[PDB]
Amino acid sequence: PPFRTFSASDWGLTHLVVHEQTGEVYVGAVNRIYKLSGNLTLLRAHVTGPVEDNEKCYPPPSVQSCPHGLGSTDNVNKLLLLDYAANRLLACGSASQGICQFLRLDDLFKLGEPHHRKEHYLSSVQEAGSMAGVLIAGPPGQGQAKLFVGTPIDGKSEYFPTLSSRRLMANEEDADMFGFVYQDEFVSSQLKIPSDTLSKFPAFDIYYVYSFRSEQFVYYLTLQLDTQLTSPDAAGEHFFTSKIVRLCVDDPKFYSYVEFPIGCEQAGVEYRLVQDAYLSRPGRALAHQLGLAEDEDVLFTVFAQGQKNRVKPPKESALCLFTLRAIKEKIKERIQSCYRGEGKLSLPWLLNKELGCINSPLQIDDDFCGQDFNQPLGGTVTIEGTPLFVDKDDGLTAVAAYDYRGRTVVFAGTRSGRIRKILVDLSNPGGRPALAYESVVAQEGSPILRDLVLSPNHQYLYAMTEKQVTRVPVESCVQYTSCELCLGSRDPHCGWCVLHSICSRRDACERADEPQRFAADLLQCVQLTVQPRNVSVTMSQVPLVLQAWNVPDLSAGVNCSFEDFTESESVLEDGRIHCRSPSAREVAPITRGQGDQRVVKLYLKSKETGKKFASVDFVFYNCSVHQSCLSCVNGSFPCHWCKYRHVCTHNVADCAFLEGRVNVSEDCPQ
Ligand SMILES: *[C@@H]1O[C@H](CO)[C@@H](O)[C@H](O)[C@H]1NC(C)=O
Ligand SMILES: *[C@@H]1O[C@H](CO)[C@@H](O)[C@H](O)[C@H]1NC(C)=O
């Protein structure tokens, strides 16, 4: 069937998110904020630009006068999140130093847009995709909600923090919105880049890709400019280095900060340029394969080769895997290694002067949220990842995943606009851990954007490009017509509903829990055999006996349908299906014309469904047309040559005399 489509205006899209319950689709974009419905039908929208502003205006002209001017410029939506507790939506733009609006859920009514404080502004960058974060509501009923936000600052370190823990009041008009959850004379739930570090390398910055809540913490995948591999001259050879970061939800002074490099390799190829990430529960399959508990989560990642460029990395990309276990371990290992006095905190950009690790007798837990020394703590060894798939022709751009009845499925967007469906398994008799079993095309010629989430019923995945969104069905099982290639494609959702003769999902096959109703393994397609397989046109209604294999309890009833000429009703005994061959009256127009023999499909039509599902080849033949003694005998099937009548027939009473019976080729006359 065709692809559900939603085009865009004259500009471009940036962010999407789905209400976990209503399945509605909120879409962030330049100047606009579209809200769609379950089938990508355009609903409500909300306009936010262009506005009169200059990037050089701190504060924006809408609060205090500015020299250097202004001019109408586009307001790119950089971040977009849902506040389920307060039933609203936060869409942060790039205009007027990046204020944020609060659109009420059910009509996008501008509930507020606080735009007059210093900490009401977030960043003056014009690029999108560099901001990310999550919300954390406190105890319900008690109107506070925390919100952890990271963004680049383009060297404007006095104005905007690069990472904070601001507050969310229930009343949007309030001026305490977006205020830091802990404020004192020196440390705040903040993290400004030192004016020193920008003095070494001018436009150093932290770009923030993904962010997810896990246990009682929040993690970020950042990408910073390398303080080592880059000379102070900021020409165009500047290299970058990807690093994870982690905080506590309950850490007001921001002592728990921690930062480890990430990457992976396969066949000696380096991958250290992060692109996208998705936090998923791995499903019972990959869980027991990896040793993880049923509540422990996993993070899929996408790294580009090398450390250069970044604004347009090279195509070669890899889909690597990091376990939440191995990360809580490398953390409790670097902060256990510190609270022992070994090494030193190693954040060359945040600390400048190499403070050393301090000894301490405190014994670290899994839930240790830092103390006033040995923080913020750096990363010494680059965390290495497990490669699942590499592609060199058509680059990878986005990722997502989920589980199906144990199995672990990975969806990956491409720069060409396709979305490959990946199955990950380590015990595959190939060694290799991932197979690209499909390549749906959502829109040729447009890179997929990194936002790529499923509907609540996990049935569809909304795939957004710059130009349009495309509701692609996960279970695209219908395209396959026969058991032989429905299960041979290796789609984990697809099995063959044997009695309905269709390739579909498991719960869509009626009564599929009873034995022999759904088809799992390739060596289990329906098989039918006939005794006898061949009969001469001279015979009529001879009783056949058929043995069907891998079929359910057919006591519901089954018919013998000879293509579309007869519909004999059958009887069932033990494991065999008895029914009658056609009468030669039915057979007559069938062989009228063909010549030597004709094969016909013996189907099994079930009474429960009414549709034919099992096939087997059945053959008729007519010994008459054969002209010589060798034409008769050497034919495969049992034909008798009547040497005295000079004809070829079946039933030997047809010969001139018995002694005219010629069965074998050697009894031919010369
Ligand atoms: C989408 O669903 C709504 C639900 O009422 C329906 O009115 C609308 O016609 C549908 N549009 C498309 C294109 O499927
Ligand atoms: C015809 O059918 C009989 C019984 O099913 C089988 O033994 C024989 O080998 C078959 N021969 C041909 C030529 O199909």
XYZ file of C-alpha atoms and ligand atoms in Angstrom, residues 4-5 37-43 471, ligand 1:
24
model
C 1.292 8.190 4.331
C 2.674 11.631 3.461
C -2.639 13.489 14.178
C -2.215 9.723 14.149
C -2.073 9.533 10.338
C 0.126 12.612 9.659
C -2.922 14.770 8.906
C -2.284 18.444 9.420
C -4.092 19.767 12.505
C 4.605 7.076 8.347
C -6.754 10.793 9.156
O -7.646 10.415 10.240
C -8.737 11.324 10.453
C -9.498 10.829 11.660
O -10.813 11.367 11.696
C -9.600 11.397 9.199
O -10.652 12.333 9.404
C -8.747 11.833 8.018
O -9.524 11.848 6.826
C -7.552 10.899 7.842
N -6.725 11.357 6.739
C -5.979 10.551 5.979
C -5.232 11.217 4.867
O -5.905 9.343 6.185
